Short mmCIF file of C-alpha atoms and ligand atoms in Angstrom, two decimals:
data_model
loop_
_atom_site.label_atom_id
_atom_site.label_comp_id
_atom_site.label_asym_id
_atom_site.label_seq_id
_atom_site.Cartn_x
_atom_site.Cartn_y
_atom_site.Cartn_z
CA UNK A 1 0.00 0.00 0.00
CA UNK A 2 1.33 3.27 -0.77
CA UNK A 3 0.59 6.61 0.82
CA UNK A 4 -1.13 4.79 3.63
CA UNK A 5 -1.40 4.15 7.30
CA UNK A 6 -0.74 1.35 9.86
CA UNK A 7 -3.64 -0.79 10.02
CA UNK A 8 -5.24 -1.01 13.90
CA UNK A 9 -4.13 -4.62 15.09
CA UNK A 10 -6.73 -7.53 14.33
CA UNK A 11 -9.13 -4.92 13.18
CA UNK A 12 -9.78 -6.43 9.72
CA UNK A 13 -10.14 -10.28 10.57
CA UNK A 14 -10.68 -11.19 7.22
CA UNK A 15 -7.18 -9.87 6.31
CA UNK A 16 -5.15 -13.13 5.06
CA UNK A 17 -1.58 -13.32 4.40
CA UNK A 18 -1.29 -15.65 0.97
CA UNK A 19 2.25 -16.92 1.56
CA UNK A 20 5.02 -18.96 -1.33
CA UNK A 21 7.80 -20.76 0.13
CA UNK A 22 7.35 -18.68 4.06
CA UNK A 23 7.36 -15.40 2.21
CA UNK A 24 4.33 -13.06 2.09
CA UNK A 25 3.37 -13.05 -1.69
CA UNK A 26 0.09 -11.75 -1.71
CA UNK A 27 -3.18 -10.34 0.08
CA UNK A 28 -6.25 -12.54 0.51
CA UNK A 29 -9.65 -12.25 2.10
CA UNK A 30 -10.89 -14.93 4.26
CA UNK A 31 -14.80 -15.90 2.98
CA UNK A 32 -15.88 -18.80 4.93
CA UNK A 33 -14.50 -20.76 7.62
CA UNK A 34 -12.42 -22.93 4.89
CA UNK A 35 -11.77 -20.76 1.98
CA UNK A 36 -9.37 -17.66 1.10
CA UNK A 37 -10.72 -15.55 -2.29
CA UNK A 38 -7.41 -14.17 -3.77
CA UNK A 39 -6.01 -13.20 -7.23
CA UNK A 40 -4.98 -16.21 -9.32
CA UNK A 41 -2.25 -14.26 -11.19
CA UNK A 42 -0.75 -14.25 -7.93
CA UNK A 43 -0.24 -18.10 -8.31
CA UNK A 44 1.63 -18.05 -12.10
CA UNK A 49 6.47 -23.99 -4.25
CA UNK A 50 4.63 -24.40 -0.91
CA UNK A 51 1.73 -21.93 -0.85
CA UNK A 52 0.30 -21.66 2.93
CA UNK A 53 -1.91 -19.22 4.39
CA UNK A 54 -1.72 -16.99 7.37
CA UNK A 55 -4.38 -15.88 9.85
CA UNK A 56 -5.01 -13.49 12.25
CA UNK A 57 -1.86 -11.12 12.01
CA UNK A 58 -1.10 -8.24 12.22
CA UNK A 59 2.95 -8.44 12.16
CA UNK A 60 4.43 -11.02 9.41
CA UNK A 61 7.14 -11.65 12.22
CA UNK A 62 6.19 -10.62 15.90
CA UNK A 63 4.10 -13.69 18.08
CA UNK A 64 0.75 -12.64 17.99
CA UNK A 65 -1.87 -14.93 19.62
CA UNK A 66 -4.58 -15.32 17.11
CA UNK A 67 -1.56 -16.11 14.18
CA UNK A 68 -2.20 -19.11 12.70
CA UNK A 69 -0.66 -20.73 9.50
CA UNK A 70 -2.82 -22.87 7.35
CA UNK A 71 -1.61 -25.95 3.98
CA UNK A 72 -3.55 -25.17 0.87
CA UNK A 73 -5.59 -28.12 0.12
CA UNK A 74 -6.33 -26.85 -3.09
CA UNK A 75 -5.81 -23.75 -5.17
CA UNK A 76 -9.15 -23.14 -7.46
CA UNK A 77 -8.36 -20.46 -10.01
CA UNK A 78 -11.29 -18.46 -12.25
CA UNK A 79 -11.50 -21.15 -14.81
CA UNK A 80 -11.75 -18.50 -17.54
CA UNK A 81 -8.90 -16.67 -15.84
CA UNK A 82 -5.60 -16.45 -18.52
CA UNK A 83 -2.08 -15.05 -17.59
CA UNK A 84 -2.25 -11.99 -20.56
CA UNK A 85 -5.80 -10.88 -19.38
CA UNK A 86 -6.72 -8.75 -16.37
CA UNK A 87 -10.29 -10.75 -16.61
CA UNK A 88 -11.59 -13.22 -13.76
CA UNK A 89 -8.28 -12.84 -11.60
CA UNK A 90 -9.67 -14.58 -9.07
CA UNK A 91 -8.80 -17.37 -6.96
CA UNK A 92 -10.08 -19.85 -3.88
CA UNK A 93 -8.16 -21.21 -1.66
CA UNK A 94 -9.34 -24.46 0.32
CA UNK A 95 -7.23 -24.12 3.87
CA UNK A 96 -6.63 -27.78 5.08
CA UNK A 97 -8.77 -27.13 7.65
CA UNK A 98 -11.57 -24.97 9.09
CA UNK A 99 -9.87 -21.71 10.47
CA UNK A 100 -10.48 -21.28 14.54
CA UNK A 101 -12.80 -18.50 14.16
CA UNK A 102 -12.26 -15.87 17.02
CA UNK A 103 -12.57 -11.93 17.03
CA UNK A 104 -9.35 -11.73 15.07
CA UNK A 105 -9.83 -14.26 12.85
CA UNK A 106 -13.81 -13.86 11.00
CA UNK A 107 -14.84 -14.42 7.26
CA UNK A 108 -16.21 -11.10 5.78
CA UNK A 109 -19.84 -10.70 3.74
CA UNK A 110 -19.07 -9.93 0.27
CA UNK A 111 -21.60 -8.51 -1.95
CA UNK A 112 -24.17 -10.18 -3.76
CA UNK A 113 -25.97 -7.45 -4.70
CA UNK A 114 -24.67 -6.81 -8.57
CA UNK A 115 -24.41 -2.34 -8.79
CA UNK A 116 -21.44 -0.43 -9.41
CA UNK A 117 -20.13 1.74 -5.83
CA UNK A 118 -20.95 5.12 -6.64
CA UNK A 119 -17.96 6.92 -7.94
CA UNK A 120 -16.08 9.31 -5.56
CA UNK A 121 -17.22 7.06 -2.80
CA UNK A 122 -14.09 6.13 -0.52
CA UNK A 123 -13.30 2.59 -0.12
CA UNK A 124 -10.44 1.08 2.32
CA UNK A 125 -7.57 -1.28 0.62
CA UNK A 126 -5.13 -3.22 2.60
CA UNK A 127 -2.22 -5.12 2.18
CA UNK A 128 1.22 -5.98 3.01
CA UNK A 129 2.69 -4.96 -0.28
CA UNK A 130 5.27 -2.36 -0.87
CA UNK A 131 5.15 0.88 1.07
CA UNK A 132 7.39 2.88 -1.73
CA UNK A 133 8.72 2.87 -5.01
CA UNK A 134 11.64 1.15 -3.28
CA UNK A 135 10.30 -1.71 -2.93
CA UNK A 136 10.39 -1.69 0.69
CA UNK A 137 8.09 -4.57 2.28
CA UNK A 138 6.24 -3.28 5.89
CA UNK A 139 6.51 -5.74 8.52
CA UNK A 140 2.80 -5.21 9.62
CA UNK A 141 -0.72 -4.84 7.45
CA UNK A 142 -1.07 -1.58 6.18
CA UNK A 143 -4.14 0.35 4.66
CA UNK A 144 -5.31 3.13 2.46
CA UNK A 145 -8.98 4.72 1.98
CA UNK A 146 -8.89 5.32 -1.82
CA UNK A 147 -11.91 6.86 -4.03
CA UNK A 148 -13.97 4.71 -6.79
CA UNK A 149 -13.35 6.38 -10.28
CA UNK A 150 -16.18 5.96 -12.84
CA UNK A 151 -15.77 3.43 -15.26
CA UNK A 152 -15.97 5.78 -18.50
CA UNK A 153 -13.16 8.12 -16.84
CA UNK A 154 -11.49 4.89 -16.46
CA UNK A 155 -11.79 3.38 -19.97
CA UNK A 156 -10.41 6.73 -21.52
CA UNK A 157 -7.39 6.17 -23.69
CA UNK A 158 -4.81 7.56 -21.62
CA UNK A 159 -5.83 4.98 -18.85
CA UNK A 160 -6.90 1.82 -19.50
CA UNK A 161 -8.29 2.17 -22.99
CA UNK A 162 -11.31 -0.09 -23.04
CA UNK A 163 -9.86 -3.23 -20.68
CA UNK A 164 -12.79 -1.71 -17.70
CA UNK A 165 -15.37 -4.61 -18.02
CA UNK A 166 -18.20 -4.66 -16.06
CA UNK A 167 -17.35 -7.09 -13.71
CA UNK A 168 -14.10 -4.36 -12.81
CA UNK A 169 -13.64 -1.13 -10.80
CA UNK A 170 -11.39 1.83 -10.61
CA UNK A 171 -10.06 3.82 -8.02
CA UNK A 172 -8.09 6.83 -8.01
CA UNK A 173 -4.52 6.25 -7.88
CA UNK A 174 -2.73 9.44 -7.28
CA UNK A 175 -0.25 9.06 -4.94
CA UNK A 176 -2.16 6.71 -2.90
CA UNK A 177 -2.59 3.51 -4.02
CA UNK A 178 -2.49 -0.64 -4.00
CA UNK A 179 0.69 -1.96 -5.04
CA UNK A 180 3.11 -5.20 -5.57
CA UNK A 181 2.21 -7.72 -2.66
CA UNK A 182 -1.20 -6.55 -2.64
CA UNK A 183 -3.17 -7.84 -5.21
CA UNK A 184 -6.01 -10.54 -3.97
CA UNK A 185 -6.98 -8.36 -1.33
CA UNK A 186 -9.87 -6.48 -0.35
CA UNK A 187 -11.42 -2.96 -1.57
CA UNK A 188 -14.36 -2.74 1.25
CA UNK A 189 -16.97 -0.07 1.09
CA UNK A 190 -19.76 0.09 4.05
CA UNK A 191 -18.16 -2.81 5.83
CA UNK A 192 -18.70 -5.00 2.49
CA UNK A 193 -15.99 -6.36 0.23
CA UNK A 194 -16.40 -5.30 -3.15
CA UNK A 195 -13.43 -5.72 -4.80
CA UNK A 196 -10.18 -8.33 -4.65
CA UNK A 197 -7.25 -6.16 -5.78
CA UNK A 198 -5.37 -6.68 -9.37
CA UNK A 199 -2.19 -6.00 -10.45
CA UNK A 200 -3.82 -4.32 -14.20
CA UNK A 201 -0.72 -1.65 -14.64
CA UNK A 202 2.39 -2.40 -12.81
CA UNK A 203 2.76 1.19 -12.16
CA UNK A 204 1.20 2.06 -8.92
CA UNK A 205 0.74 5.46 -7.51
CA UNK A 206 0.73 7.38 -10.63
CA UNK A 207 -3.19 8.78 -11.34
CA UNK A 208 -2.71 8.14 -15.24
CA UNK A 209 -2.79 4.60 -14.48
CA UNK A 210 -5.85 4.10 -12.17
CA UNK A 211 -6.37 0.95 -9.76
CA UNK A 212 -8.16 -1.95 -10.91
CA UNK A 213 -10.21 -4.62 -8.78
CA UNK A 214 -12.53 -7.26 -9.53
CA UNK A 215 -16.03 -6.51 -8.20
CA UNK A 216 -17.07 -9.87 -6.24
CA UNK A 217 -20.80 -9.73 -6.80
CA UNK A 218 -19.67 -10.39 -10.44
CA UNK A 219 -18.62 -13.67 -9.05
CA UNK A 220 -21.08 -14.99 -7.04
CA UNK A 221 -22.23 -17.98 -8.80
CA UNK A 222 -18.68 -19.02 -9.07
CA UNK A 223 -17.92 -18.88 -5.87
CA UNK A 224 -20.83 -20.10 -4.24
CA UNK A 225 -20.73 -23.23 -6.66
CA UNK A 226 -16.90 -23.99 -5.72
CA UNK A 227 -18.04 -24.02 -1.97
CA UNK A 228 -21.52 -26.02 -2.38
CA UNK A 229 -18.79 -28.83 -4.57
CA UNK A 230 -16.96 -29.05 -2.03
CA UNK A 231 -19.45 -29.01 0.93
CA UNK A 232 -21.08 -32.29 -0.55
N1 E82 B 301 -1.78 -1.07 -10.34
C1 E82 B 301 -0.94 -1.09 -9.12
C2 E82 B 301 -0.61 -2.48 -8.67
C3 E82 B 301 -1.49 -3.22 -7.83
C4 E82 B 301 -1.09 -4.49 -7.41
C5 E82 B 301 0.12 -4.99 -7.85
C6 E82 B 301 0.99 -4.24 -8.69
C7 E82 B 301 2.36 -4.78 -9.08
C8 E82 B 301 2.47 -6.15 -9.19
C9 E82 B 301 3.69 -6.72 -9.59
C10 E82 B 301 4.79 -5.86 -9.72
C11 E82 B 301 4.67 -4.47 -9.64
C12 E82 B 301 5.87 -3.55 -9.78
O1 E82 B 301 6.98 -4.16 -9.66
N2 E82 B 301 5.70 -2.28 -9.92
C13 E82 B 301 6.85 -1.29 -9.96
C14 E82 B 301 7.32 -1.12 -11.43
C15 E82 B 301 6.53 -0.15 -12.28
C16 E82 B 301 6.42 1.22 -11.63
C17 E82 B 301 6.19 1.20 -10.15
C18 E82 B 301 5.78 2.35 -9.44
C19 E82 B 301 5.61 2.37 -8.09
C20 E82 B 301 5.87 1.25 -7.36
C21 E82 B 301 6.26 0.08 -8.03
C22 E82 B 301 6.44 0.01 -9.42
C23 E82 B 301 3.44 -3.90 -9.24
C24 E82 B 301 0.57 -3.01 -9.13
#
């Protein structure tokens, strides 16, 4: 996250830490007791993830490292598009759900977030062009830019599909490390963040993040399979 703030410990239980060989890799949101939504790209090693931190490194007593059972990826998902970047991760077990550790509602009901509204991003990506990695989850409240702003030419020229969002990115903005997770508005996850331009921070080159309620019969089907 760039031009952001330290996150409030445990405030955001749904924050999950998608990790690649011990390493935090990318951001994840947890969505039921067993399953992580995340960004497939983020997948193109041991992939594990972590729970209920705050700090990547301190002891915390909610942390708690999860195995993958299996990695689900958008099945029209492709590495050269930005479309259906998402992904669901089975955890080899049912998290221990506790005030730091909860799933968190996504929305089902399928309308764009008013532009201009402000909508809070977190992550444990990069905290400057640097390249320098925080140590503990960071966030940033960042406002929804309408699509046809968006789609201009000198942004993203026509790759803002329906089932995508903007937000501004001057200055502020998601960044490497935290693509897959969550752009909440109300309380409500509405978007899982995507990489789209690697350039981050610059307002020419807005954010992009898959709206959820887009998703729903995806998801919900990949849970009910695995339920039975
Ligand atoms: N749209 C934003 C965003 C959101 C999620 C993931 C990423 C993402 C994913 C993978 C790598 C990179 C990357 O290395 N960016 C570098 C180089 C270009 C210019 C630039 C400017 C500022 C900071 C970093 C970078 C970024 C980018």
């Amino acid at each position: 996250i760039l031009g952001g703030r330290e996150a409030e410990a445990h405030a955001r239980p749904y924050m999950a830490s998608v990790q690649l060989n011990g390493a935090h890799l990318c951001g994840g949101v947890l969505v039921a007791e067993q399953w992580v939504l995340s960004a497939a790209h983020c997948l193109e090693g041991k992939v594990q993830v972590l729970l209920g931190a705050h700090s990547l490194s301190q002891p915390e007593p909610s942390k708690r490292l999860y195995d993958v059972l299996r990695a689900v990826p958008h099945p029209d998902s492709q590495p050269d598009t930005i479309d259906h970047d998402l992904l669901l991760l089975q955890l080899s077990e049912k998290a221990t759900l506790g005030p730091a550790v909860r799933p968190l509602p996504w929305q089902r009901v399928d309308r764009d977030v008013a532009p201009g509204t402000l909508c809070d991003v977190a992550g444990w990506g990069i905290v400057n062009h640097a390249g320098r990695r925080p140590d503990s989850l960071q966030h940033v409240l960042l406002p929804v830019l309408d699509r046809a702003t968006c789609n201009r030419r000198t942004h993203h020229d026509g790759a803002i599909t329906e089932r995508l969002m903007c937000a501004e990115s001057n200055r502020r903005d998601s960044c490497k490390g935290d693509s897959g997770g969550p752009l909440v508005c109300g309380g409500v996850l509405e978007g899982v963040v995507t990489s789209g331009s690697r350039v981050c921070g610059n307002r020419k080159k807005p954010g992009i993040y898959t709206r959820v309620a887009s998703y729903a019969a995806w998801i919900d089907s990949v849970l009910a399979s695995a339920a039975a």
